[PDB]
Design an enzyme around this catalytic site. Structure first.
Site, PDB file in Angstrom:
ATOM      1  N   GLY A 169     -44.640  45.697  69.397  1.00 24.58           N
ATOM      2  CA  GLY A 169     -45.743  45.083  70.108  1.00 24.58           C
ATOM      3  C   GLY A 169     -45.637  45.358  71.588  1.00 24.58           C
ATOM      4  O   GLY A 169     -44.550  45.612  72.120  1.00 24.58           O
ATOM      5  N   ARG A 170     -46.788  45.302  72.252  1.00 28.01           N
ATOM      6  CA  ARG A 170     -46.884  45.513  73.687  1.00 28.01           C
ATOM      7  C   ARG A 170     -47.873  44.514  74.271  1.00 28.01           C
ATOM      8  O   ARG A 170     -48.782  44.036  73.582  1.00 28.01           O
ATOM      9  CB  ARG A 170     -47.323  46.953  74.038  1.00 28.01           C
ATOM     10  N   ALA A 228     -49.361  43.082  78.562  1.00 29.65           N
ATOM     11  CA  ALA A 228     -49.532  43.486  79.963  1.00 29.65           C
ATOM     12  C   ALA A 228     -48.197  43.615  80.695  1.00 29.65           C
ATOM     13  O   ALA A 228     -48.010  44.521  81.510  1.00 29.65           O
ATOM     14  CB  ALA A 228     -50.439  42.489  80.686  1.00 29.65           C
ATOM     15  N   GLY A 260     -44.940  43.461  79.191  1.00 29.43           N
ATOM     16  CA  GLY A 260     -43.744  43.804  78.437  1.00 29.43           C
ATOM     17  C   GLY A 260     -44.057  44.229  77.026  1.00 29.43           C
ATOM     18  O   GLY A 260     -45.168  44.680  76.728  1.00 29.43           O
ATOM     19  N   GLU A 261     -43.074  44.030  76.150  1.00 32.03           N
ATOM     20  CA  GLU A 261     -43.134  44.535  74.788  1.00 32.03           C
ATOM     21  C   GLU A 261     -42.416  43.561  73.856  1.00 32.03           C
ATOM     22  O   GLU A 261     -41.652  42.689  74.293  1.00 32.03           O
ATOM     23  CB  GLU A 261     -42.503  45.929  74.698  1.00 32.03           C
ATOM     24  N   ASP A 289     -56.991  32.334  73.659  1.00 28.91           N
ATOM     25  CA  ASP A 289     -56.893  33.765  73.402  1.00 28.91           C
ATOM     26  C   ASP A 289     -56.678  34.005  71.914  1.00 28.91           C
ATOM     27  O   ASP A 289     -55.818  34.778  71.496  1.00 28.91           O
ATOM     28  CB  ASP A 289     -55.781  34.369  74.257  1.00 28.91           C
TER      29      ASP A 289
HETATM   30  C1  LIG Z   1     -49.064  38.045  79.448  1.00 28.12           C
HETATM   31  N1  LIG Z   1     -48.608  38.482  78.139  1.00 28.12           N
HETATM   32  C2  LIG Z   1     -47.776  39.661  78.004  1.00 28.12           C
HETATM   33  O1  LIG Z   1     -47.468  40.282  78.970  1.00 28.12           O
HETATM   34  C3  LIG Z   1     -47.325  40.116  76.607  1.00 28.12           C
HETATM   35  C4  LIG Z   1     -46.149  40.851  76.445  1.00 28.12           C
HETATM   36  C5  LIG Z   1     -45.787  41.254  75.165  1.00 28.12           C
HETATM   37  C6  LIG Z   1     -46.575  40.959  74.064  1.00 28.12           C
HETATM   38  C7  LIG Z   1     -47.755  40.242  74.231  1.00 28.12           C
HETATM   39  C8  LIG Z   1     -48.647  39.886  73.034  1.00 28.12           C
HETATM   40  N2  LIG Z   1     -47.907  39.963  71.766  1.00 28.12           N
HETATM   41  C9  LIG Z   1     -48.040  41.018  70.945  1.00 28.12           C
HETATM   42  C10 LIG Z   1     -47.339  41.117  69.741  1.00 28.12           C
HETATM   43  C11 LIG Z   1     -46.457  40.043  69.402  1.00 28.12           C
HETATM   44  C12 LIG Z   1     -45.698  40.043  68.200  1.00 28.12           C
HETATM   45  C13 LIG Z   1     -44.827  38.999  67.892  1.00 28.12           C
HETATM   46  C14 LIG Z   1     -43.981  38.926  66.591  1.00 28.12           C
HETATM   47  C15 LIG Z   1     -43.271  37.769  66.154  1.00 28.12           C
HETATM   48  C16 LIG Z   1     -42.691  38.173  64.925  1.00 28.12           C
HETATM   49  N3  LIG Z   1     -43.029  39.424  64.664  1.00 28.12           N
HETATM   50  N4  LIG Z   1     -43.804  39.845  65.645  1.00 28.12           N
HETATM   51  C17 LIG Z   1     -44.322  41.185  65.637  1.00 28.12           C
HETATM   52  C18 LIG Z   1     -44.753  37.937  68.788  1.00 28.12           C
HETATM   53  C19 LIG Z   1     -45.486  37.916  69.965  1.00 28.12           C
HETATM   54  C20 LIG Z   1     -46.353  38.986  70.270  1.00 28.12           C
HETATM   55  C21 LIG Z   1     -47.094  38.968  71.484  1.00 28.12           C
HETATM   56  O2  LIG Z   1     -47.013  37.902  72.373  1.00 28.12           O
HETATM   57  C22 LIG Z   1     -48.119  39.830  75.508  1.00 28.12           C
END
Ligand SMILES: CNC(=O)c1cccc(Cn2ccc3cc(-c4ccnn4C)ccc3c2=O)c1
Length: 384
Positions: free
Chosen positions: A71-72, A74, A76-77, A186
């Site tokens: 996952g990504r 804004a 981080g990842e 969101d």
């Molecule tokens: C201001 N926000 C940011 O910068 C930001 C940074 C990184 C990711 C995100 C959005 N995102 C995307 C995929 C994701 C996947 C899991 C997860 C839990 C168990 N499996 N998986 C795949 C948990 C949280 C997220 C998640 O938050 C947002």
């Protein structure tokens, strides 16, 4: 009455907040320019060697094998990781400290951490550990191997019996968020994750805001994702927004439209076209003629995709639940998370990531000349 707060994990002055403060003091002063001050060096002499030792005993990124990025966002990842000492598998979210401060939002993560840590709900991804180093915040979550709802929709033509079930779980997940006093803001399929049994949990609480005693929020910033943002949150931009939890129900209508139609109902070629399609929703919402959508489904979608004053759910979730769209032979509102999900994932390993697409492949703070204090906003993030 104070030694309670040292032990209290929600406290601002527990042992792990206190260590954060020590650690960030050392990081924000240990530079040659600042060690010309003797006070500063008198401190770094005394503490720099034990602070480096406790940095080794505290949880750190190097305690984990990074298996894959899944996952990504804004800032981080999200990584699939295995804790090497314990061999337990987790999802680990990284937030760049440089990029949260260079873009002047460094406070959203507090609510995300607290919800996942303390919601204790089957509808919310649980957080087990939060820690940090000089570059990143880290959130260690349960891994959701079923993937997200974007991946499910890209892989299937979604019959109404399925949309029925996923809509209901989203409704219940949002209702649990609301009962904690929060508006999500969101809601979208990227934020909806599926566990090993194919049941839903919500994950990305970066936009979440606590409500008034009236159940409202004051906000003057449009937030969320362009395809899913509601008229009232869009309109609140620069204009003293005052709105309630029912904005989340608008996103549920967009979700259900996308599941049954294949596209979002306000798709446009440009962001500003999307914004203006949404403002003009009374005329822009249009079902494709070849879309064989039932009349209960069309009714529920149009009941969500209206203005807040007449939106289904404005009065509570009981009126959402009784909607005839939800009549079915598989589940009740009372037991839905204990029934068989529509897609049960076939998982080959405890690090099986087949329900997540691959993602391909940083800047750092400038060495300071005076005390800037870039680490101060992250004091108290650590949590065990
Ligand atoms: C201001 N926000 C940011 O910068 C930001 C940074 C990184 C990711 C995100 C959005 N995102 C995307 C995929 C994701 C996947 C899991 C997860 C839990 C168990 N499996 N998986 C795949 C948990 C949280 C997220 C998640 O938050 C947002």
């Amino acid at each position: 009455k104070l030694e309670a707060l040292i032990r209290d994990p929600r406290s601002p002055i527990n042992v792990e907040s206190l260590l954060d403060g020590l650690n960030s003091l050392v990081l924000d002063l240990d530079f040659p320019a600042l060690r010309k001050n003797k006070n500063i060096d008198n401190f770094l002499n005394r503490y720099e060697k034990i602070v480096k030792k406790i940095r080794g005993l505290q949880m750190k990124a190097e305690d984990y094998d990074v298996v894959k990025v899944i996952g990504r966002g804004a800032f981080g990842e999200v990584q699939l990781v295995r804790h090497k000492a314990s061999q337990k598998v987790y999802a680990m979210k990284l937030l760049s400290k440089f990029e949260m401060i260079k873009r002047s939002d460094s406070a959203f993560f507090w609510e995300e951490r607290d919800i996942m840590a303390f919601a204790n709900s089957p509808w919310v991804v649980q957080l087990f550990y939060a820690f940090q180093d000089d570059r990143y915040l880290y959130m260690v979550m349960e891994y959701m191997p079923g993937g997200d709802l974007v991946n499910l929709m890209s892989n299937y033509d979604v019959p109404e019996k399925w949309a029925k079930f996923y809509t209901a779980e989203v409704v219940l997940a949002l209702d649990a968020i609301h009962s904690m006093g929060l508006i999500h803001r969101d809601v979208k399929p990227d934020n909806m994750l599926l566990d090993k049994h194919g049941h839903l949990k919500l994950a990305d609480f970066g936009t979440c805001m606590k409500m008034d005693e009236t159940g409202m929020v004051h906000c003057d910033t449009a937030v969320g994702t362009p395809d899913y943002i509601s008229p009232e949150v869009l309109k609140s931009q620069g204009g003293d927004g005052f709105y309630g939890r029912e904005c989340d129900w608008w996103s549920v209508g967009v979700f259900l439209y996308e599941m049954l139609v294949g596209d979002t109902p306000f798709y446009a070629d440009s962001l500003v076209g999307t914004y203006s399609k949404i403002m003009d929703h009374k005329n822009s919402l249009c079902f494709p003629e070849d879309a064989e959508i039932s009349k209960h489904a069309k009714n529920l979608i149009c009941a969500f995709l209206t203005d807040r004053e007449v939106r289904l759910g404005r009065n509570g979730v009981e009126e959402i639940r009784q909607h005839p769209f939800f009549k079915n032979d598989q589940w009740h509102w009372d037991n839905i998370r204990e029934t068989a999900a529509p897609v049960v994932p076939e998982l080959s390993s405890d690090i099986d990531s087949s329900n997540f697409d691959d993602i391909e492949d940083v800047e750092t703070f400038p060495i300071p000349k005076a005390f800037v204090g870039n680490q101060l906003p992250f004091i108290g993030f650590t949590y065990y």
